[PDB]
Design a protein around this ligand. Sequence first.
Ligand code: GAL
Ligand code: GAL
Ligand code: GAL
Ligand code: CL
Ligand code: CL
Ligand code: CL
Ligand code: ZN
Ligand code: ZN
Ligand code: ZN
Lengths: 644, 644, 644
Amino acid sequence: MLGVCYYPEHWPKERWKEDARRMREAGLSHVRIGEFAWALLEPEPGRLEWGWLDEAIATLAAEGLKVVLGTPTATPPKWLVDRYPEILPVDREGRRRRFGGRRHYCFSSPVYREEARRIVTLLAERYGGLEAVAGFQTDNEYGCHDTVRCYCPRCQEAFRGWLEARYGTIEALNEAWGTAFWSQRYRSFAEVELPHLTVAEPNPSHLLDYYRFASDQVRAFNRLQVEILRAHAPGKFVTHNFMGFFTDLDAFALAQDLDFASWDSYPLGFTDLMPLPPEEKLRYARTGHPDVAAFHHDLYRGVGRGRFWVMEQQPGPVNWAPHNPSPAPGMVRLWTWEALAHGAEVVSYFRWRQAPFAQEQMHAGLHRPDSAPDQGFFEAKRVAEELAALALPPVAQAPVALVFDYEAAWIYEVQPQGAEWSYLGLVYLFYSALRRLGLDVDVVPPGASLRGYAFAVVPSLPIVREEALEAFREAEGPVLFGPRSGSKTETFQIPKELPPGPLQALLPLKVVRVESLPPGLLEVAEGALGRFPLGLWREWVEAPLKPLLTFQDGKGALYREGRYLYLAAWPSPELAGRLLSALAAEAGLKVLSLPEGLRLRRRGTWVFAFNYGPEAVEAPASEGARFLLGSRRVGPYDLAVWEE
Amino acid sequence: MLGVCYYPEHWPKERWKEDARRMREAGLSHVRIGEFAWALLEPEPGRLEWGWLDEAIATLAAEGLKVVLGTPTATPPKWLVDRYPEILPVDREGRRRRFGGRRHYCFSSPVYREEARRIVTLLAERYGGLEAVAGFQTDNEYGCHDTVRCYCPRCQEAFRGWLEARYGTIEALNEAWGTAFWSQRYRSFAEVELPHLTVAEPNPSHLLDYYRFASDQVRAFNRLQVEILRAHAPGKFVTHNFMGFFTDLDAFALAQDLDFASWDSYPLGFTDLMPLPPEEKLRYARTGHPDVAAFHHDLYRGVGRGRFWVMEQQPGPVNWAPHNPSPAPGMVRLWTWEALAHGAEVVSYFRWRQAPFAQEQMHAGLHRPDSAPDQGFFEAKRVAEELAALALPPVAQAPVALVFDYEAAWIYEVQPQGAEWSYLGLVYLFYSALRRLGLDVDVVPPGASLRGYAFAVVPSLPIVREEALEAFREAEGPVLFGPRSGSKTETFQIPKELPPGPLQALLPLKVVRVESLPPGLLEVAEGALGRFPLGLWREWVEAPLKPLLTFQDGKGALYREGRYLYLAAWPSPELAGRLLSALAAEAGLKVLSLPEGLRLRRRGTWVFAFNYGPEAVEAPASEGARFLLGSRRVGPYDLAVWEE
Amino acid sequence: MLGVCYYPEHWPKERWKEDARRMREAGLSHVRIGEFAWALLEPEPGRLEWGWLDEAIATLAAEGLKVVLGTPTATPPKWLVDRYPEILPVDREGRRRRFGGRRHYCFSSPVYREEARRIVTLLAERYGGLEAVAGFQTDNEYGCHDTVRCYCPRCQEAFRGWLEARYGTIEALNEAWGTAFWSQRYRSFAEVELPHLTVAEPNPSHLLDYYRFASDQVRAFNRLQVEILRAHAPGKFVTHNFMGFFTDLDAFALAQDLDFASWDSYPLGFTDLMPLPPEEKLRYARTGHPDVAAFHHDLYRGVGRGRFWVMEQQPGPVNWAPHNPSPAPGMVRLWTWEALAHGAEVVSYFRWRQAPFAQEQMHAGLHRPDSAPDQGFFEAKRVAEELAALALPPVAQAPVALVFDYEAAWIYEVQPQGAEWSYLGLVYLFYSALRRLGLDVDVVPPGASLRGYAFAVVPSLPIVREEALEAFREAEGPVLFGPRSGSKTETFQIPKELPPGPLQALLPLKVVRVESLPPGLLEVAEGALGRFPLGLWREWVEAPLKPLLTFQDGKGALYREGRYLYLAAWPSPELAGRLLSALAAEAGLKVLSLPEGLRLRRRGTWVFAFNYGPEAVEAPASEGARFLLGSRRVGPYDLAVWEE
Ligand SMILES: OC[C@H]1O[C@H](O)[C@H](O)[C@@H](O)[C@H]1O
Ligand SMILES: OC[C@H]1O[C@H](O)[C@H](O)[C@@H](O)[C@H]1O
Ligand SMILES: OC[C@H]1O[C@H](O)[C@H](O)[C@@H](O)[C@H]1O
Ligand SMILES: [Cl-]
Ligand SMILES: [Cl-]
Ligand SMILES: [Cl-]
Ligand SMILES: [Zn+2]
Ligand SMILES: [Zn+2]
Ligand SMILES: [Zn+2]
């Protein structure tokens, strides 16, 4: 199913009927509206004007379109901000932000909590029972513009309450943080402040708990809205639109209070911001890196416990990246089918028509400002026509699972120890390695069952809790643990047994020292798998095990015991590919050496081939395969679907 | 005529007579003093000490030197600052600046407005009628050190008043800014704040009006002083010293209240700061890029409605650039003759003698700190001797006009959409293209008559007002419009007809999409003019017109209809040169393919050839040409003047 | 003698006896403790708990270990900070810092002065007479984390008092600073503020006095503690641990109140932060640049009037650099013997055991967190065993002296005039030049006698006082003055006679102009010494002297008159090496062209050869030389000691 993000409040009411009609002709079935309409729903404090919203919903409903309503807490009215100044967030620098853009509010502000409660309850009671309404989107991209973590007075006092609940006694906190160090000892929770603007570096345990707290604050803010929607809008789904490459917010945790996860895909923008090699940045400027959208579809399908939507899909050039190219001809269609192949229930485009005013006037839509259809429109219409004839098989369990963890991201954010150490970069590297082997991937959280997977990859899991350990023990196939795994306790301390901590119950090895190396410093690690120049991060492993790969000084780089493997160094794409290929073979999985721009994704017995260009490539379809869409020869920015 | 900037207050009174005498022997006729002497004119609040200033003026007058007095509002006394703390400006970060340097005052401060009024009136009444005084310079470089835009309380309230005058009703402002977007809607002007420190990006219309307002504040501050000088100092000219590569202040607008424009040329400093290719940064380290001074002489001659002075001319190394080389031997003379060739009425050097103390102790002067003459002195004296024998012909209208616009600069500053998009860079690129063809240029504002020009170039004019449109319609020769021209309405919105907006009355084409591309991403645009790899910025043009240049995907890069041309992509120096050359030929203009370091400028029937080095070059003088200065073979850092 | 930094308060009391015992078995004789224990010594305001400290000292004393006690003023308890908020420092940006790390206090705070006085007096009275205590370390690394210079209210008022003492009358200050410039004139000391956040650049004289003041504040704070230790702890030495590449604090001045200087060596961390050529950054990642530790041993031996300790020695990877490699096998031993060869009385390692919690949990120690001995332990034990059999000859005067000056650093920090101008970089360049010639170096301050030196090098001495001049006049061998020497008066003004100012009494030459050039801009300076492409900085010298090296334009680059030489340009390593080699030969000193990774240092008749790798090299030992340690063939990361 296809949808679109619409803003009735940006156009003359006369255009509404025409818009709704063309949305239906285009083949769209869902429409999202209202997330930025607070100032229009309540221009004056207490004076509610539902007139236009009732009409807009009515207009869309008349064309048989399902409405997705978003609560408007992302952008509170200027009068509300002026009334309660405490609502405005304070950056890490200590400066109070201002009205003028969006997301100018703090998750700790108790006043904003009540203001949100009020408007959401009103909205929920009024439209909660409508048949035209299919569900809601809470707020809009929690955390965008670095807003998950706030540094105002409200946060400091809220942080103390959080800490007391977690530790009970200030004594437990002192021990956990190791406050004897640098005379940081606290006499009471009242003495603890936010971990910012400290002389020298702040305490890692202190900073991590702050990150945990910040994320929890967002979930609490969201939970409030979900409770209201469940009480006054029964039967209507509730979701939230997560972002690409964003870890400040624990999406796994927050999604527990949702019916399914949704996310906003802008491949070109993410790619322009990614530090890719020179050649790739140019090659994928108009397509996005081949795995940029796919990684997130897999992640969010996992975050949504198997269900997710692409609430916002790029339909043309955006406005916020340093460089904003136009998607190449056919990419909007490719991204759409890709999302669907990865299991997206709905792919909704942002937005229906390009706005001629304000901040995002340069952000394209399915239509230009003069209402003429833009390139994205024709591509979406095409997908609608193709989809009508192609009911999709169900999404099956992928052969490989990738264990992703938000907490891990916070830990490495707090203590990189190596300037080039990157959690997302490490995760992405393993992901692309699997993808280049033609393998489908399921992203899951620590503790989730690995039952049924041929093998699993854990880019890095610094903290290994009992639940996670159990899931690993019950694993039916091999599990590869990345560097720094099990290197921290829950309180951000080095395990008494040293890394890999709890994992030592599975692997008889100890990391006695780690190194972060300057770029360019490489040393070959070699063995039966091959020869691999490696750098950036290296660990000294003490173990009775014969390493599978050894550096020139004789130190091991990769170890294995039973079904468990441990990588003691930052992997290169080459090593990741060969190691993963070897595991796939051992598991009886067939693999393909896909060319640089080709990607595959299965759905049932069907196989989708997406060509990110710039030249045509042949789809590795079995002989006699029956093509449902496209042909064996896949042109650039094009695709193919067949029965394998 | 030649002059110099002098600081009597920096030297023992005994040196004054000797200085005045040597200024006359050197051949100087004008001397500027007093812009930084407030603390010396009023060391105690209310206690005026004109003793030294009366004597200094007397001393200079005795040698027959014309005095140019500058009002001292650029640097208010520490006691005045301590009295009225509101005077101190606040940076974009929200921090209050302090005394210690200069320009530490806000243009909005109503108190400073009165303090300025007072000191200027006193100064004007006392010296306004003196025969020794030829005129005044108001303040000193408005905006230096990013001081045009202030973010204190005074600015916020002053901005509201400005907005109400411009829009009348808050309704008109909401519509203009499109405040429905992100619930930015305002109930009254009282709710509008300064467009800074907002979460996410501020509204472009909001930010643009703030820039318009900031510039207007400076003009108002200046207008006050001009009114006083016109009332108490009749017959005495009034000017201001503008800066190189500075657009925060609308020089065209402010200069309307002046008799002529003046500017401060420091080629070496501007060049070290310019992002030039590696080879050029080294080649022109001691000379300045060949067009750095020339572009500004042309710009300011236009800003001054045909009249301008170089109030400050670099005579040796400066102190403020990351790298401060010495001008190569002969460059001070070259820069001086160049300024004169471009029509400068007076070329005044900063400064007479290098100060041995304070911030600019490393800034050279015509004399070293021990009073011995420095290299600049001999070069200036030489120009004086040469000039005495060479009365100059009048400045004629250039064959080509370049339409420059400060408002355009603000728009692109507010919305670059592409990280490498640069208004000054685009302007400079077209300028150097014309200059390398040996063509003289006149810089004019939008709306100014293009009557008499062979053809005109408009690097980019986002907003096209009726007056500008009219000037284009009445154009006698071709007009080339650069990318993004006519892409915005006065309220920073996309024209209903889409770009190029009003220009569509002249060119039947529409820009339906634009792209900003990462550096290195190039695609050949080809046609009869040649083959040109282009990047950075590209536009999709919908039109019945057959493009003159076409990209590999078939999209047009350059269009023409009648006398109007439109460039839909960022030009390379190669394209700019060939396109401009083709236009010159069509207009019957003769062109020359000047070598990299050679530049020409005419004055009457005379032609000046300036060689920026590093090696000698031949001046392309017609046969039998009569040389007034130099020879056909122009050594590096040297020049030639002949009758063509 | 060898020692270690220990933190009893970080481990269970049960481990104390075992630790003390193993410290003795390892061969250690000194142990430092207590610098970060304030919060443990006084958890409650007024409640002193010396229990654990008495026991720890007792435990260490029982093994026959000498205790080095550090006063705990570096990290004041959170309750003390909460009580007196004024204690917290304010950064240059104007932001108040917070508790959470360390060094969160201001040197100006009069309240903290008394709090320090109290705790230090208590500590001194209680342990001052113990036989187990050998001495004290005041605070801990004054200035770490840019804390020497503070910008709070206390500093502003303290700065005024300082200024009045130095100048007497505001008139003398106005003249010294040249406040006539930009109307900076002051009516009284009360009007002078801190030189920060000024519009445009602050006055150099103003900023320099602030730097002088800031350093003096630290010495005063330290002097207080020294007075207390001399009164209540007679016979016990007093020292302080200075840092590498840190000039904010005048170590020469402060060390006058100490018995000897101490410093903290972390070669890997300093090197990763040094801007070395690509090849060297990789080659020395695990060893540190060959001269990084040595330069500081020489500097601090000089700062300590001939006596110094390495209070903290890197024993493994650290946690604070962008990249933290492990020292290569044998480097801890090499660094230890190197320090001893340079005269270090004691080499104390930081730290005994790696902490499993807090900020430096990734900072290695002699033991891992599980108490197992780490690589550094075995290397230190080896040095202990080797040292026992090798009593060392006394340190003799080096053949060459290098004149280092902290004030010079402040001047160039205030006025680089060239972006790449670097005082430490210039000093280091001359130092490495001498070191590559196999020459030993003594670092001394201006004014110190140069009697006995073959020749001396003065990288740069902007201000030349009478004492310094006298020392130069009495020099027995040649003295080489680097660029910008004698270019400033004590009040940061250009000497009336122009640079090199007072040095013109020794050299008949004047610097009439200087240039700072962009990187890549090079010009050959040539003469009998060779041909040298030079750049970055160049001076125009007016003199009757025939330059020894001349640029292509005929301007001199190097001059000499009698025993005095003057370099008018930034030297390349090649020029520094040849110039220094020529001077050594003339002085009858023998020199060696040591390979890139080899370094030598003598002690008595012994010669130490340190090989920084990566490959083996031959020690240039005279024939028949008797080796005390190692062999003629020195493996990488290894060393040799022999009788020459
Ligand atoms: O591409 C820009 C988009 O970024 C987010 O997805 C946001 O939710 C949208 O409202 C829009 O601003
Ligand atoms: O080159 C430095 C100069 O910069 C501006 O031109 C200013 O007006 C002068 O006073 C001087 O500071
Ligand atoms: O290597 C890190 C070290 O830095 C300084 O030397 C400090 O005095 C030590 O306490 C430790 O923090
Ligand atoms: Cl829309
Ligand atoms: Cl002067
Ligand atoms: Cl320890
Ligand atoms: Zn807040
Ligand atoms: Zn202001
Ligand atoms: Zn302070």
